[PDB]
């Protein structure tokens, strides 16, 4: 099945938030890839992290990774309008034939 | 790198349509490709998977109906969607995955780099 | 080795790209082919 993400997110600009993701453990012991996608609205996704913390091209610092096992954890700090987007989280593992998607998350700045 | 998408459009229950989907600064043949559909409003979903040897997975809820197809002249895929149905209803797109499979076996993987723009596809009556 | 109750620590040095990081925590490592496949040493007199 899908991944849980909570559907909505909200914080103050300049803060710090983070969006959860549930169930990686779901599916077999085999180490879990876990990466995350920003997609404005109308705009297509664009990959924004894998291998949980390793930021990606154009990524800034304001983004990173943590994981618990079965939780992972991106946070996004220094909260500017630019971040408001929606979030995917996914996971994949050798032997699937689909990386399991997220549910997504609408992040919000207030 | 990039990816041009064209085709798609408008069919009744039924109907068929034809989405195309053409790379520069690679070749789809030697790639690990995905198609994808997000419906208005809601999330992304599988549709098909193409490695680079050429074979095809589809989600059950498309096999039978939907084929993919490799447009070499044109370094391009063909997505040929037959016996529509309103679920189809959407926005497609053609994607780019970067693996690590050494001598067959994996080690790395980075995920999907390459994105179409997405062609919108409405299935109606 | 080799009274097959007589284990023993051993280390040694594996060019990394044919290590994969085992499927759990990441001090554990493995063979990048073992859970697949059969692994054979290549003998003295037959480097063709
Ligand atoms: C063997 O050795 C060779 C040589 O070392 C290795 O080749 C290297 O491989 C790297 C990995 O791909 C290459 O890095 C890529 O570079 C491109 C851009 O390269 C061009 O531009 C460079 C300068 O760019 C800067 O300056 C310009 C203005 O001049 C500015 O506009 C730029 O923003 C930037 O600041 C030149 O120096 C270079 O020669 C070349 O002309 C870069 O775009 C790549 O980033 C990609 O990131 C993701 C994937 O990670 C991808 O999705 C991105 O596309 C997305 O974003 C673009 C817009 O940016 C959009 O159009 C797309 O639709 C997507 O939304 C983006 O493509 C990446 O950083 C490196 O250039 C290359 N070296 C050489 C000399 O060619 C090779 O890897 C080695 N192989 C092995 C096995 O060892
Ligand atoms: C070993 O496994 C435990 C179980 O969760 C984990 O807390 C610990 O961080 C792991 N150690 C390493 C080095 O990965």
């Known amino acids: 099945s899908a991944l849980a993400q909570p559907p909505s997110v909200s914080g103050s600009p300049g803060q710090s938030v983070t969006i959860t993701c549930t169930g990686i453990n779901d599916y077999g012991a085999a180490y879990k890839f876990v990466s995350w996608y920003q997609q404005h609205p109308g705009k297509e996704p664009r990959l924004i992290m894998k291998n949980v913390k390793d930021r990606w091209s154009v990524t800034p610092n304001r983004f990173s990774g943590s994981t618990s096992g079965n939780t992972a954890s991106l946070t996004i700090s220094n909260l500017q309008s630019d971040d408001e987007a929606q979030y995917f989280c996914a996971v994949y593992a050798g032997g699937f034939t689909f990386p399991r998607l997220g549910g997504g998350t609408k992040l919000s700045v207030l | 790198d990039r990816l041009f998408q064209s085709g798609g459009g408008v069919s009744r229950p039924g109907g068929s349509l034809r989405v195309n989907c053409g790379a520069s600064?690679?070749?789809?043949?030697?790639?690990?490709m995905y198609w994808l559909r997000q419906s208005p409003g809601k999330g992304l979903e599988w549709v098909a998977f193409?490695?680079?040897?050429?074979?095809?997975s589809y989600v059950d809820s498309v096999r039978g109906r939907f084929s993919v197809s490799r447009d070499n002249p044109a370094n391009a895929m063909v997505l040929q969607m037959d016996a529509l149905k309103i679920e189809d209803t959407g926005t497609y797109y053609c994607?780019?995955?970067?693996?690590?499979?050494?001598?067959?076996?994996?080690?790395?993987?980075?995920?999907?780099?390459?994105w179409g723009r997405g062609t919108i596809v409405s299935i109606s009556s | 080795t080799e009274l097959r109750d007589k284990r023993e620590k051993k280390n040694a040095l594996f060019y990394k790209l044919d290590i994969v990081q085992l499927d759990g925590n990441s001090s554990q490592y493995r063979l990048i082919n073992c859970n697949t496949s059969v692994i054979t040493q290549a003998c003295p007199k037959v480097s063709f």
């Open positions: 600064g690679f070749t789809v043949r030697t790639h690990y």
């Open positions: 994607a780019r995955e970067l693996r690590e499979a050494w001598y067959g076996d994996l080690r790395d993987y980075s995920g999907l780099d390459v």
């Open positions: 193409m490695n680079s040897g050429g074979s095809v």
